[PDB]
UniProtKB/Swiss-Prot annotation, chains A, B:
The keyword Secreted applies. Insect defense peptide with a broad spectrum of activity against Gram-positive and Gram-negative bacteria and fungi. No activity against S.aureus. Stops respiration in bacteria but does not permeabilize their inner membranes. Its main location: secreted. GO terms for biological process: defense response to bacterium; defense response to fungus; innate immune response; killing of cells of another organism. This is Thanatin. It comes from Podisus maculiventris. Four regions are important for the activity: the C-terminal loop, the last three C-terminal residues, the stretch of seven N-terminal residues and residues 8-9 are necessary for the antifungal activity and dispensable for antibacterial activity. It comes from the Eukaryota. Keywords: Antibiotic, Antimicrobial, Disulfide bond, Fungicide, Immunity, Innate immunity, Secreted. It is found in: Secreted. Disulfide bonds join 11-18.
Length: 21, 21
């Protein structure tokens, strides 16, 4: 890993869906 | 309070912070 401007992550307990932080 | 238009919930693994769905 070199770049990671993203803090945490959270998945959506539904129709195979998710979202980034 | 009375209503709940939010299906699921996700907490933020950081400085005592969270968010609603």
């Amino acid at each position: 890993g070199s770049k990671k401007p993203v803090p945490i992550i959270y998945c959506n307990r539904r129709t195979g869906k998710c979202q980034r932080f």
